[PDB]
């Protein structure tokens, strides 16, 4: 059992800003992590997996980083449709545990 | 799984299964290596913590501490003896006691 304790509870930003979301684990999930975008009213979608990868279809502005215990997801060209909550699902231990969530607003 | 043997004492070694404890019946017992036959009953004897089993004057084991639960059990050999037939003589009757 591994718990997701990502530090940013919520981040305030606007269009054309820089936002970094840091996810924290408790054991060796060094290269088994995924990121998801959850727009209200619809199912989540995958954008980053294996802590460094780009899903086929997503734009080239979301980049995963970090290895070991800490993991950071960074965006450099924030766009209004990207405003949602983010989760860092693990993949090391088989009982996968999702993340708490991180809301981003319009400011 | 690669096992290996060495002069050092073994640290990984197999388990020892146990049977449920029964009393008031002559049953063979193996209490942590003590082998014998007798009737096991609850005992009021007071054992020191390190002491494991008791002996009598004639060096015959009488009390043993159960390994799983720290309680004292008295070992009593199950009954034996002789059989004697009481008869009034076949010249009078064939009924015996």
């Amino acid at each position: 059992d591994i718990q997701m304790t990502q530090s940013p509870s919520s981040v305030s930003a606007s269009v054309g800003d820089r936002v970094t979301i840091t996810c924290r684990a408790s054991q060796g999930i060094s290269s088994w992590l995924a990121w998801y975008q959850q727009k209200p009213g619809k199912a989540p979608k995958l954008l980053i997996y294996a802590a460094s990868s780009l899903q086929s279809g997503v734009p080239s502005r979301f980049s995963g980083s970090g290895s070991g215990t800490d993991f950071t997801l960074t965006i450099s060209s924030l766009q209004p449709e990207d405003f949602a909550t983010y989760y860092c699902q693990q993949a090391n231990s088989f009982p996968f545990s999702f993340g708490p969530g991180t809301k981003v607003d319009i400011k | 799984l690669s096992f290996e043997l060495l002069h050092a004492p073994a640290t990984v070694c197999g388990p020892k299964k146990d049977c449920n404890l029964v009393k008031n019946k002559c049953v063979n017992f193996n209490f942590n290596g003590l082998t014998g036959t007798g009737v096991l009953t609850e005992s009021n004897k007071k054992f020191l913590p390190f002491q494991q089993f008791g002996r009598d004057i004639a060096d015959t084991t009488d009390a043993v501490r159960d390994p799983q639960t720290l309680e004292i059990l008295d070992i009593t050999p199950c009954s034996f003896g002789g059989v004697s037939v009481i008869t009034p003589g076949t010249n009078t009757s064939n009924q015996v006691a």
Partner: protein
Amino acid sequence: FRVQPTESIVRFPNITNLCPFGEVFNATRFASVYAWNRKRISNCVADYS
């Protein structure tokens, strides 16, 4: 006249610290052959049944 024993019982201390083979044969992700991983299991009661 002699009564013979009816059952045979054996008592041994509680089996504790069973060996951790559960992780080895059940882990979600095993290693690639070139990097075979070695786990030294020690000080334990091992049951292969």
